[PDB]
Amino acid sequence: TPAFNKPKVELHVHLDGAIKPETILYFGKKRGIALPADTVEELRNIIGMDKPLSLPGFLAKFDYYMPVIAGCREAIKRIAYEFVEMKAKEGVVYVEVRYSPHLLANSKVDPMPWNQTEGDVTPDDVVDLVNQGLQEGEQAFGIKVRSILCCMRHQPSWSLEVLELCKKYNQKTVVAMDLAGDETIEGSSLFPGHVEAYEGAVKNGIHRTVHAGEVGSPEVVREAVDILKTERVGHGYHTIEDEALYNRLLKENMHFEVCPWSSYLTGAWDPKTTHAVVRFKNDKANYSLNTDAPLIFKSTLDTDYQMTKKDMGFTEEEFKRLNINAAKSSFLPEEEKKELLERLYREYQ
Ligand SMILES: OC[C@H]1O[C@@H](n2c[nH+]c3c2N=CN[C@H]3O)[C@H](O)[C@@H]1O
Ligand SMILES: [Zn+2]
Numbered sequence: 001t002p003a004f005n006k007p008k009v010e011l012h013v014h015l016d017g018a019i020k021p022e023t024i025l026y027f028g029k030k031r032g033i034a035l036p037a038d039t040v041e042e043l044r045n046i047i048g049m050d051k052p053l054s055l056p057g058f059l060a061k062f063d064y065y066m067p068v069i070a071g072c073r074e075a076i077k078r079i080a081y082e083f084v085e086m087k088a089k090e091g092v093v094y095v096e097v098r099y100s101p102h103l104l105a106n107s108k109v110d111p112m113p114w115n116q117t118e119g120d121v122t123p124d125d126v127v128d129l130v131n132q133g134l135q136e137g138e139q140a141f142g143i144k145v146r147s148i149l150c151c152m153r154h155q156p157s158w159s160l161e162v163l164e165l166c167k168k169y170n171q172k173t174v175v176a177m178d179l180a181g182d183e184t185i186e187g188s189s190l191f192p193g194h195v196e197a198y199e200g201a202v203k204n205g206i207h208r209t210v211h212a213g214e215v216g217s218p219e220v221v222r223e224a225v226d227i228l229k230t231e232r233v234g235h236g237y238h239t240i241e242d243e244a245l246y247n248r249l250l251k252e253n254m255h256f257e258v259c260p261w262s263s264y265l266t267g268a269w270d271p272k273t274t275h276a277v278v279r280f281k282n283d284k285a286n287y288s289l290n291t292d293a294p295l296i297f298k299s300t301l302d303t304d305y306q307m308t309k310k311d312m313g314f315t316e317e318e319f320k321r322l323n324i325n326a327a328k329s330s331f332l333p334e335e336e337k338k339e340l341l342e343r344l345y346r347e348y349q
Pocket of ligand 2: 012234
């Protein structure tokens with residue numbers, strides 16, 4: 001009984017947020033790097049979230065394990081291959097994985113993430129390494145996987161390079177640019193680096209997606225849409241607070257990348273108020289149902305389906321509808337997007 005035992009499309013999930021506790025454990029020992037536990041189970045309890053934390057609270061969990069992956073070619077390549085494997089088993093036929101190339105490098109990055117020591121794993125190298133892992137998993141498990149590079153809110157110095165990385169690796173997996181991180185940083189959307197990287201994404205035809213409204217007010221969504229030119233909005237739960245904005249976006253067919261479980265666990269969604277996804281569903285909005293960071297929410301793609309099904313009252317007709325909208329809104333080239341639509345319509349028959 002998996003809520004939606006049919007092909008799915010995932011548009012919103014972070015690679016460094018969907019690693020197997022087993023792989024984390026393996027490289028800790030292998031590199032002699034300290035973890036907060038030496039058992040996959042207790043490692044799941046230190047990293048995982050039980051009840052709602054906050055955004056900065058959730059973001060902190062990465063500290064427990066990122067140091068173990070970063071700077072290790074074998075590790076970056078392996079988590080990528082293993083991610084496809086994970087998604088294949090969830091019955092996902094198309095996925096867009098996102099991650100920050102800088103937070104995994106150890107050379108040519110400033111400031112040095114995780115107190116690393118100069119190495120040879122350059123930000124470019126991590127993109128190439130992940131491509132090889134993703135490509136190898138596509139062949140082995142038979143699914144299509146594409147990737148998105150993330151700009152980090154607190155480091156706009158990195159953004160112009162994320163843009164060049166998206167250009168160099170255009171279609172060689174890289175399909176878009178994301179703006180991720182601590183949304184709570186006042187005006188972090190307007191920082192020049194971010195603004196210029198996005199002005200550049202536009203002139204070079206690089207697809208754009210931006211995390212907004214997960215926790216910030218509607219204005220942050222307005223900045224993403226109007227100033228950064230997002231083609232999609234990660235979360236966007238607060239947009240409904242501005243009926244004007246919302247309705248305008250609704251008429252523009254703006255895609256909202258929803259992650260139900262996630263909103264509850266980051267305190268993004270107050271359990272005492274109707275979920276914005278119920279509105280999106282009811283107004284027939286363009287959106288998708290995503291996992292965001294399974295490792296930290298101790299969740300699976302099914303977790304979210306099961307959630308919208310039990311509470312919120314979603315149905316298979318709706319499940320089928322949103323997955324069709326997710327495919328239409330993918331950052332896939334037309335010919336490939338058509339191919340996806342065909343496949344879903346076939347298996348939905
Ligand atoms: O996945 C790349 C990075 O995006 C950030 N991230 C992960 N989950 C989220 C997030 N930023 C904002 N909201 C959340 O959906 C993390 O700092 C991780 O290192
Ligand atoms: Zn996210």
